[PDB]
């Protein structure tokens, strides 16, 4: 059969209050969005790592570890006093990264 | 230094016309979105593989690099009804293992 090299875990995120946008700024994410008289609760699909490196790595010639990478998704947010549609950083994957020894 | 086990590539995607939503249905993705008298071009951040995996113990493991996905909300069309739907886009390149024999 088939296994992950790095064990991931995926959930819905419905209680996001803060985030950093693509321009590097810390912003406030609203709980509710309004698109043409339609009230949707603002939810996010996120994937990250599940906490001796990665599975199946040739450990003789390689150090390694599992790391959470991210994606940018559009979201309704607040940069101080100005509300806007901004791209924000959320967890999206767990991937293995290598390192040569010595 | 530090390397990827699987080589990925990330781009903006601004010409998406179709997609499959989270319920398994093939839907049409609109080019433009309208949120409170504000017209935004509908863009997507996607990552995928660059055409086994680097650094794998190939003696005990078969392996290959594979594109995984995420769900992101988008303005869409299921036939005649416009709606805010989660759709599947490329989000990562990850290695998957397989025991030999």
């Amino acid at each position, epitope marked *: *059969g*088939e*296994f992950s090299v790095c*064990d*991931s875990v*995926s*959930v*819905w*995120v*419905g*209680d996001k209050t803060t985030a950093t946008d693509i321009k590097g700024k810390e912003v406030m994410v609203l709980g509710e969005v309004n698109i043409n008289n339609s009230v*949707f*609760k603002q*939810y996010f*699909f996120e*994937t990250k790592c599940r906490d001796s490196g990665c599975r199946g790595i040739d450990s003789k010639h390689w150090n390694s570890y599992c790391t959470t990478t991210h994606t940018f998704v559009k979201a309704l947010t607040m940069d101080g006093k100005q509300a806007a549609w901004r791209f924000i950083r959320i967890d999206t*994957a767990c991937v293995c990264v290598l390192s040569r020894k010595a | 230094g530090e390397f990827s086990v699987c080589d990925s590539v990330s781009v903006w995607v601004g010409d998406k016309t179709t997609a499959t939503d*989270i*319920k*398994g*249905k093939e839907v049409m993705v609109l080019g433009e979105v309208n949120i409170n008298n504000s017209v935004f071009k509908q863009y997507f951040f996607e990552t995928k593989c660059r055409d086994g995996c680097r650094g794998i113990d190939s003696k005990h493991w078969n392996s290959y690099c594979t594109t*995984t*996905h*995420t*769900f992101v909300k988008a303005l869409t069309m299921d036939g005649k009804q416009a709606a805010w739907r989660f759709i*599947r*886009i490329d*989000t*990562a390149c990850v290695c*998957v293992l397989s*025991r030999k024999a």
Partner: antibody, heavy 121, light 108 residues
């Protein structure tokens, strides 16, 4: 430390309503889909519907809109409701957590035991 | 809907044998195919998802394959605890559907 437990009446007459609650523990309903499933005696499983993480729902069209699911995230409970029962609704009913491997595939990773329901006069 | 079919709903094998549970989708489901084990005690457990992937805490001897609309679960080295019913499920599209299951007798 992840379980689901369903509690229900056991007997309801034709044309009366049905309420089952799924009590959940070891995880939060804010983050996970919950599915409802049904196995009539000596027959195959049948998916009834689900409440997504965000509170939205989808139902099996075969039920002709007789079924509804609602939830209270703070109380860790999902609520199945069915109107206008028939002897055909005689089954064991179970709730199951939805689990995702990225947005790539989807499965039911954790299953409740099941509550037996007989519809009869 | 997408029908999932398990044409042989009964199977009998001996300890150590390799058994194949098969499943057929009525339309292409690509890889959105899960395998469950319902033991006689009533409990249900996810064995395999996405055709061939293992859920955590599942034996090496389980194995998932597929060709076209056909999908197999293979249990190598059959052990006594494998007395159960084995059923598939497509997670491609709503409504989700299940095969009617394949019950496994272990000879003695």
């Amino acid at each position: 430390q992840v379980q689901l437990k369903e509690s229900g009446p056991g007997l309801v007459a034709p044309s009366q309503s049905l309420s089952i609650t799924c009590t959940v523990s070891g995880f939060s309903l804010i983050g996970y889909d919950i599915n409802w499933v049904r196995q009539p005696p000596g027959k195959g499983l049948e998916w009834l519907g689900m409440i997504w993480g965000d509170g939205t729902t989808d139902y099996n069209s075969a039920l002709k809109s007789r079924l509804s699911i609602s939830k209270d995230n703070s109380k860790s409970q999902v609520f199945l409701k069915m109107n206008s029962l028939r002897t055909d609704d005689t089954a064991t009913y179970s709730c199951a957590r939805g689990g995702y491997y990225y947005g790539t595939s989807y499965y039911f990773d954790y299953w409740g035991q099941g509550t037996t329901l007989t519809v009869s006069s | 809907d997408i029908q999932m079919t398990q044409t042989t709903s009964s199977l009998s094998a001996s300890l150590g044998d390799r058994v194949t549970i098969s499943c057929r989708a009525s339309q292409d489901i690509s890889n959105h195919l899960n395998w469950y084990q319902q033991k006689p005690d009533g409990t249900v457990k996810l064995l395999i998802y996405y055709i061939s992937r293992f859920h955590s805490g599942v034996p090496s001897r389980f194995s998932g394959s597929g060709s076209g609309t056909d999908y197999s679960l293979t249990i190598s080295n059959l052990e006594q605890e494998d007395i159960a019913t084995y059923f598939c499920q497509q997670s491609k599209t709503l409504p989700y559907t299940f095969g009617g299951g394949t019950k496994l007798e272990i000879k003695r």
